[PDB]
Structures are given as structure tokens and as C-alpha cells.
Design a protein around this motif. Sequence first.
Motif, PDB file in Angstrom:
ATOM      1  N   UNK E  16      33.383  85.694  43.399  1.00 39.26           N
ATOM      2  CA  UNK E  16      33.745  84.275  43.483  1.00 39.26           C
ATOM      3  C   UNK E  16      32.746  83.513  42.349  1.00 39.26           C
ATOM      4  N   UNK E  17      33.510  82.558  41.758  1.00 42.85           N
ATOM      5  CA  UNK E  17      33.086  81.640  40.741  1.00 42.85           C
ATOM      6  C   UNK E  17      33.498  80.204  40.961  1.00 42.85           C
ATOM      7  N   UNK E  18      32.590  79.152  40.773  1.00 41.65           N
ATOM      8  CA  UNK E  18      33.175  77.802  41.265  1.00 41.65           C
ATOM      9  C   UNK E  18      34.233  77.178  40.336  1.00 41.65           C
ATOM     10  N   UNK E  19      35.481  76.665  40.894  1.00 43.51           N
ATOM     11  CA  UNK E  19      36.271  75.974  40.061  1.00 43.51           C
ATOM     12  C   UNK E  19      36.161  74.835  39.468  1.00 43.51           C
ATOM     13  N   UNK E  29      40.633  75.342  38.127  1.00 47.46           N
ATOM     14  CA  UNK E  29      40.322  76.622  37.685  1.00 47.46           C
ATOM     15  C   UNK E  29      39.044  77.192  37.566  1.00 47.46           C
ATOM     16  N   UNK E  30      38.941  78.478  37.828  1.00 44.78           N
ATOM     17  CA  UNK E  30      37.649  79.029  37.853  1.00 44.78           C
ATOM     18  C   UNK E  30      36.898  78.926  36.513  1.00 44.78           C
ATOM     19  N   UNK E  31      35.692  78.685  36.353  1.00 48.21           N
ATOM     20  CA  UNK E  31      34.642  78.456  35.406  1.00 48.21           C
ATOM     21  C   UNK E  31      35.159  79.617  34.302  1.00 48.21           C
ATOM     22  N   UNK E  34      38.727  79.338  32.698  1.00 46.96           N
ATOM     23  CA  UNK E  34      39.000  78.370  31.755  1.00 46.96           C
ATOM     24  C   UNK E  34      38.883  78.345  30.481  1.00 46.96           C
ATOM     25  N   UNK E  35      39.690  77.890  29.717  1.00 45.56           N
ATOM     26  CA  UNK E  35      39.597  77.792  28.135  1.00 45.56           C
ATOM     27  C   UNK E  35      38.497  76.781  27.882  1.00 45.56           C
ATOM     28  N   UNK E  36      37.436  77.140  27.370  1.00 43.25           N
ATOM     29  CA  UNK E  36      36.334  75.967  26.908  1.00 43.25           C
ATOM     30  C   UNK E  36      36.237  75.709  25.391  1.00 43.25           C
ATOM     31  N   UNK E  73      42.648  74.312  31.806  1.00 42.76           N
ATOM     32  CA  UNK E  73      43.627  75.284  32.551  1.00 42.76           C
ATOM     33  C   UNK E  73      44.600  75.839  31.421  1.00 42.76           C
ATOM     34  N   UNK E  74      45.259  76.986  31.789  1.00 47.92           N
ATOM     35  CA  UNK E  74      45.955  77.972  30.776  1.00 47.92           C
ATOM     36  C   UNK E  74      47.022  77.100  30.472  1.00 47.92           C
ATOM     37  N   UNK E  75      47.875  76.399  31.413  1.00 46.35           N
ATOM     38  CA  UNK E  75      49.119  75.668  31.122  1.00 46.35           C
ATOM     39  C   UNK E  75      48.695  74.327  30.244  1.00 46.35           C
TER      40      UNK E  75
END
Lengths: 217, 71, 221, 25, 98, 132, 129, 83
Positions: E16-19, E29-31, E34-36, E73-75
Motif C-alpha cells: 500500500x502507498x498513499x493516494x 492516484x497512488x503516489x 502518478x506521473x510527476x 492521473x494517467x487520463x
Amino acid sequence: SGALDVLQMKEEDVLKFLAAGTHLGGTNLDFQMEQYIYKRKSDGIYIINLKRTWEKLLLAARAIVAIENPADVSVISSRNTGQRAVLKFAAATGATPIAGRFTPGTFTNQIQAAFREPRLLVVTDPQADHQPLMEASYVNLPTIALCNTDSPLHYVDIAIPCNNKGAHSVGLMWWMLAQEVLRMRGTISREHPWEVMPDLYFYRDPEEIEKEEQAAA
Amino acid sequence: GKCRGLRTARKLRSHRRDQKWHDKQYKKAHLGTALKANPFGGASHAKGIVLEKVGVEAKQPNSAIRKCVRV
Amino acid sequence: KEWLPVTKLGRLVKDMKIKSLEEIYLFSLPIKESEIIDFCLGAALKDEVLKIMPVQKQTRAGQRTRFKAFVAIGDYNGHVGLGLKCSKEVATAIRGAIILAKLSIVPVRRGYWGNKIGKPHTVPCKVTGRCGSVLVRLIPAPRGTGIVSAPVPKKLLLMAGIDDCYTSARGCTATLGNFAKATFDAISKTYSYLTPDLWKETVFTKSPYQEFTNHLMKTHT
Amino acid sequence: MRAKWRKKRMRRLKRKRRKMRQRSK
Amino acid sequence: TKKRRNNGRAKKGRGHVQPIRCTNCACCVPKDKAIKKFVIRNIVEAAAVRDISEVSVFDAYVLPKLYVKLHYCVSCAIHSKVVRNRSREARKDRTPPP
Amino acid sequence: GRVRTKTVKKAARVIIEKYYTRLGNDFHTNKRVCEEIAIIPSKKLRNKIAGYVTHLMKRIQRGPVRGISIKLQEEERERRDNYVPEVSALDQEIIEVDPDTKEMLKLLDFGSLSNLQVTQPTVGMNFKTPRG
Amino acid sequence: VRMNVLADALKSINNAEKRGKRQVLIRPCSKVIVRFLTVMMKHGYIGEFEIIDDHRAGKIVVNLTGRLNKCGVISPRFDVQLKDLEKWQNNLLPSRQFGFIVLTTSAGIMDHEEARRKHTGGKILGFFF
Amino acid sequence: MQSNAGEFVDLYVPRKCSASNRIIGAKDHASIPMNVAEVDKVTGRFNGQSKTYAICGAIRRMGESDDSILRLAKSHGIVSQNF
RNA sequence: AGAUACCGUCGUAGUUCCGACCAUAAACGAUGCCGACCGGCGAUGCGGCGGCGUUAUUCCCAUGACCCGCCGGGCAGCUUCCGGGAAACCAAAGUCUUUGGGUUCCGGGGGGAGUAUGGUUGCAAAGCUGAAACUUAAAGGAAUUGACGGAAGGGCACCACC
């Protein structure tokens, strides 16, 4: 090549390997080239064992002398540094040169104009001349390969540990080999030091051609 | 099989017996629910009284009246 | 029909100088000339088309119907070749596959089930051969058994000269090309199998390129 | 039908079946 | 069929990783997913930096930057052309484009 | 608009392969050379071929070309086969030697040569580019 | 955990044969492994080994030839009668020419050929061909 | 090979890898019988005889062919025992 | 068109905490656990070991911070004809017709159906266990080629534009 003072590493021969720098290997090391090394320097350069370099070049020379018709030991180099050295070696030994652009299917495809069908390859660098090693697989071709510490020994059947990156060290390891294949055939005599010069085999930088022109004007 | 031990006959047999029910051709034959539903009751042939004549429509690809009998 | 040979190996065959294709098979030399096998095993070599398999690639306006022909070839004593060719017309596929079969012909090793009298009749061990999901397994059988197998891998084992053979196929054998190759890979792995008969250390005889290096300079360019 | 919404139709129909079977006991 | 070995994220021994909320959307989206983008940017582009240095109280006042970390997010990342569909070989190339 | 097709370029690179000696920079000769050394059914195609011949002749006289081979390259295969320079860079009396390149020569019969030059090794065992 | 020391040895020499190693190390030695190895050696599917003797379960360095196609164990140890041995060697050995089922009889660990002569069956150990 | 009569009945005996003892197939095209020329003990010149090694393709594509000629050479005192 | 939807403004339970219940997720690495073996490489996290030299407490000694390795476990990555696999891909999904290291759970064409029924757990919601009649010639996997896209790019054209 072992326990024979006639095929001993001569006193002149070492100082050519040290000047050209054929002991002076790569930064990282291939796992199958670990047997051709004394020690790793402080400043990570792998010192190639010049005794074990010499013992392989003798073994490689035996491979080429054993081929009766000299024409069909096809000699190959794609890089800058070997293209001259191979065209010399082909006339010096009596072999076939392929200096620059090995066409895929020259060993496999029959209907190509360059359908050479040799009995032995000599290769300047596996990582550079990777193409003729993969047709050295498809037709029953033994491989000779001038190899370096960071270079892979895939498909190569006898391998000489060298500095096949360096400018002079390529041509010198060809010159040493061109001589030894002639010495053993009985063209060169082991008495007299060979007329042909090791500088003849070195790659000439076209930057140095336009500079040597004005120096020798 | 999975459990190979020399003294594992009761598990290999009881597993094979339990998992044989998941076969269709077995559970159909060895629970009598198929035989209770089978109108012939396990018989090859059976006699019966014709009481009407049905004109059954065939499946979509083949359009024709299949002249059957309600027995 | 003259056939001026293209390859080095082909030239020796035409001059009647390499006199058995067992001398070719010994040195693992690839046979790229078709008219080497039409010379050695020529008229002793029988063609049966296993199948014509029409394949289609969907194009802008319709399907391009090419025909994949499977030919098994072999003299009924030691040699089989399974060749497949995908041509646009059906006659070319058969002619193409016959040629590609001949290039691909292997020597089959045959041994004895138990007792070791007469000329050999069966597979010398339990070979396996598989391409795709089709696993084909050949097993030695006593004299007069015939080939206990499906009609198609039987059709190759008849051609191989294996008279007696138990088989146990597995996978989608209804897809023929896989089933025809898998059985062919089984009778390719007969001479590749190291039995205690083959323990006598190899006395390396002279290669035909090395034997006829005196002739491979002057009879051509 | 989404497999989740197919499942939600059953859990509303099972829920009304229990309802009717409580009325008859 | 499996499209990406990492399943399009960067958790390996977590569970688990914090959204995080997307900046364009607010899609949780999980950290690691996510695209950063850490966009360091001038408070003025090129059309105003000429006009502000002229009308400055201070000589040798370097115009300070604007530090924003963008989570996508990816979208949102693909629709705003941050990332982009690549060929099945080129997908694996993790080297950031210069 | 004026790109030569493969038909012109193949005819060009085979005429200059074979009949090289007759050819030269001048168009109007090697226009008329093609009338003797080929059967060309078109006047327009004759000029196209002969035109790219002259374009390749100015290239061949300057250096080697990707898709050509002649007996003057076979003569310069022989010329640069005999570049004998002044004495080489291998016959030096000071060849710089690392302490560890000395250790492996010390194990050999070539322990100490009069024409070597041993140095102190480079401190700061620091030979990798940082990551990123 | 390690529940057949013979099985974890026969596989170890088999992986090395598949790869083409010239000698293999097999970490736990048992009298059962040594007796299996000696039977393979009298038929000549391996070169001479040496048991390295620690004050523990010893190690063995087996000098591999390239004669061994596969060296395989049978777990569990199925007790074999002479009337059932022909059915084992039907569907465990390649041909009726070569290959050997070893099995631990009362007369000692030995191949099915030596176990036939003495007219004495026993518990199957493994096989090699 | 033999029958009851004792006659070798199979049609060819295949070669066998000099490094790993594995018989070379009829279509192992990456197989290579290589002649290492024999040098005269005191002249340093070619005798006319050769030290022939066949290595199967499964070793060459493993990257172990030039370690195994290096061992087969030193087994036949071509390469120095010192090396 | 409808829009009891997406969008927007509000807003109830809920979201938070304490104490009990529920026991389910694409609870996924869709990959049971224990052990053996079978290539390479550069990293990384942790502990230990050793090895030029820079830096800090400077005043050394021992310690941190780097640096060059080695070793053990760890999350991973790339690499290849280890080999496997229907392939995608996998140093594990390998060591499999040349089939046996030990053991657990579990599948048997698609539907009907996780349904009905009975039992059981729970305040409820539901959880666990779980059919049959009947229906049906396929459903499905991977990959290929086209066609299509309200996907992304790259062109060409006064039957496009400027």
C-alpha cells in the motif's frame, strides 16, 4: 608455444606491447576474460597479462597456418582502427579482407555477389564485429577474435586479450599476428628482425594526414 | 499427483473420489437426478400413445418445419 | 539438366569426390544445394504431400489466399526430410516443399528392441520431439509390430526405414504442421542421443573442405 | 450487464425472497 | 494480457502507498502510480523580463522562480500530452527525454 | 524535380566501373562515349546517364565512392600499402609504466629493463561518473 | 527442508551434465549417495569422485564425464519384486540395451542387472542412463 | 553399432565435442573441427600435422569455447603449463 | 429529446475519535509454503569484514561523511539460444514423456449459479457450505493481419488551405 625457447616472448616483443599499450584493458571486466588479467589498477584499468596475450596469439597463428589454402581465412574489421590492418594482413598472410561494412548474409545467402565461404574468421572486436560472429554460427566457421577485458566471448573459439580500442594497439596485435603466421609458414626467418614496420598497420587519422602534410612540406 | 509419500494411499484415493464428482459424465451417472428426470427411466426404447402432431420450427440457420409427435 | 553448383560443398559432390552424404553429415555441413540429394539418394527418394493448408492475410479489399504445402520425403532406409513452403499457387508450394524437404533431410539412427540379431528395425532409445504444444514420443518395438502411430507420423517413420515403433503423442495433434515437425524432431534426435555404443573417443578424420583444398582452387574462380 | 451490477440484482432479489419466506413462517 | 511488468507504477515490496489527488482532475492516484513533474519556472516568461528589469527599484535583482510539483492521473497526463503511447519496445525505455 | 532514377545511376556506376579510362570531367565526350559502349534506345536517357557519369567523375577524382570499384583504387590499395614513415612510436626508450604493470613484468623474466620509466600510482581511487 | 539427501544430490550432478561442467560439488554426503555414485562408476557414467570429510555430513566432488544423459531419483522408495522389476525398467529406462535402475536390496545397493543375478529385489533408489 | 554377428551396421558414427563429450548432431551448424598447427620443437616452423578439436555449438553460444580450446591446448602442451 | 447522469451550487448518513460487530476486495506478483540446484552485470537497503587518500570533532586516537571492494540476508533492475512456455513472456512460470525432493489448498466446456435448498455464523447487511432440472457448440487464451477510433505522431494535395 609452451616450453619452447624458439616461440619464447622475445625481448623486443614486450616493449612493443608496452608502447602500443596492448596490456591496457577496459574499465569493467567480462566474466570469461578474468583468466587473462594479473591485477586491477588503482584507477580501475584492467592490466591484461601480456604472457597470456602472447600464448593466445601463438595459438591463433597455429589456427591460420593449419589452413592450407591461405585465401579462405576471411579477415574482418568494421571499425576505423582495423580497416587498414586487415587489408595489410590479407596481402601479408595471403587471406581475404573485409574492411568496413560486413553485409549480413555474405556467409549464409548463396545468391549474393559477396558469397565468401571461408574456413576461419579473424575479428578485430566482438562488440563491433558482432554480425560475422552470428554467421560464424550458421556455417561451421571457427572464430579468431582480438578481445578486450570489457568485451564478450560469445561464439569466439580462440581469443587474444588486447587493447583493441587503442589506436596503435590494434595494428600492433595484427602486425604481431601477420608476422607469426608468416614465421611459422617459413616466409619470415626467426633469425632476422622483420623488414615490414608495425607503423604500416596503424590507422591514420585524416586530421593527422592534413597536419603531417604541412610538417613534411 | 501431488502428495507422493509411501503411506499416502487414503488421501490420494479420497482426493480422487472427492474430485471425481466435479466430472460431468460421473456426477450425472452416480447421482440419480439424471435418471429420475430421464423420461425412459434408464430404458433404451419405450412405447407411448400419440396424442397430437407438432410441427417444430428448426434452428435459425435452417428454416423448415420438423414434423414431430407429442407422445 | 546441368546444375553448376553455387556452394563450395556442392562442387565436390558434382565431381564424384565426396562419395557419401554421411561424409557431409559427419562434419555437420549445411546442404544448401538441392541437387546434392537428387544426386546421392536421387531416384530412391519418394514424395508424398501430407497436406495443402490454405492460409489468408486480411488486406484492405479481401483475403490473399496462399497455399502452405507440407512434403515429407525419404528413401525407406535411413533418411527423411519434412519440408514446408507457403506459395500463392498450389503447384509451386509442392515443388518448393519437395526442394526444402531435401535440404532438411537427416540421417535417422535405428537400433534393436532387446535382442540384437539381423539388421536394425526400430528407434535405438526413447527419443522425444516437440514444436508448439505437440509432444511426440517414439519407443522401440519388437520385429513385425509395424508403426503403432497416427497416420501422418507413421507416414514419416515408414519413410525413415523404422519398421517397428510404439508412439505416444500429446497436445493439439490435429494441427498437422506441428505434429509432422514434432515426429520429425524425434527422428532428428536419434543420432544426437549419446548411448554407450557412442563412447569410443572420436578419431577426427579429414574435413572434405580440407581433403579437397587442392581441388577447391582451380575447378572454378 | 456489469458482473458487479448482475451481483447487485441477485442481492436485491435474494433480499425480497427472504422477505416472502418470513411472511409464510 | 500483462502490458507492463511494473503494472504501470513503482511499488515492489510495499502492498500500500498513499493516494494523491491529480492537479487537473482530483482523481485519487497512488503516489508511485502518478506521473510527476517538478517544474521550476520564472514568474515572467520572455515578453515581460525585458520590461521589469528596466522598471526595477533594484539593480542586479535576479527575478525569482516559481517551484510547483505537478501530480497527474494517467487520463490527465496523456490528454494534456505530458506522456504518450509508445511502441512495445520503446515502452521499456525509462530514460527521460532530453 | 531532377532526381536520377536507379536505371540511370546503375548504368552510370557500371560504365565508370568498366570504361573508366575513356571518361573524364567533359560531358560532351562521355555523352558520345555512351554511343559506342552501350545500346541505349532514348536520346533523353543517354544524356541522363552521361550527365551523372560526369557528376561521379568529379567525385571519383576527389576520393573513394560508396558504390564504385576501379583499378586506380586497386593502384591506391597498392600506394597506401607502401606508406613507409619515419621510425615508429613503438621504438621509444621511455615507456611509462604503472607500479602494477611492473609487478606483472617482475614475475616474468623481463624484471627490470634499462628502457622503462616506473611512476608513482594515482591517489584518489576515483574513476566513475556519478549517477543521473 | 531437506527430506531426500540422495534426491538433492542426483539433481545437482544432473544440472551440471545439462550445462556441461567438468566436475560438480554435492553438499551433503550420505553412505547412500557414495553407494549410488560407485554403481554409476563401475558402469562408467562418472569419473572418480572424492568425499571431502568435515566433522559433519561430508561433501563430494564428482569428476563428471559427458556420458550421463540423466541421473534421476524415485521418491518414495517403492519396494520392487522380481516379477514387477521388468515393468519398472519398461517405463523408466530408454532402451533394453543401456540405462540402469539401482535399488537398495538386502545384498547391498546395486543396479537391477546385479539385483537380477542374486534373485533378490528391494526398495528402488533411482536410475541413470 | 554392433549386431550379434558383431558388424558395425549404422551408416555413420557422429563426432563428439572435445570439451563436453556431447555427440555433434547432423545439423549442429555451430560445430567447428579446428586444426591447431604443430610447430617443430627446435625450428619454430610448421611440421605438416595438426591437433584437431571438434567443439559443439551449445558451448560456443554459452561463451565457453575459447576457455575449452585453451584447456585442450594446455592438455597437449601447445599452451605453456606456466601460461 | 429525455439527463431522476457526467458539469455546477448546496447538503444527510458517512468521512474523525473511543468501545464493540462485520470477515469481504483486481485482499494481485491475478504466481501456496519449505528445501536443492542452474548464467552474467551494474546498482541499491541492511549488517559485518578489509583496503590508497579527502573532509569534520582538530590535537591525535577511535569514530561519523565520502571512496574501492568482499561477504550474508533483502526490494528490485538490465542482460543472453540455462531451459521452459500456446505465445505474451519467465533465472523463474527453469531443472517435465529423458515425466517422482516434501506438503497444503484447489480446476475439469460455456451457461443455469455462487442460484435454489438445508445447515451454520451475524443486530442487520450478509459471510461460510452449496445443488439439480434445464440449456448450449462453443465460451475462452495468446498472438497475427486488416478495418475502425470522438488515440498519438509524420506527411501529401489550388478536385485542401494561405
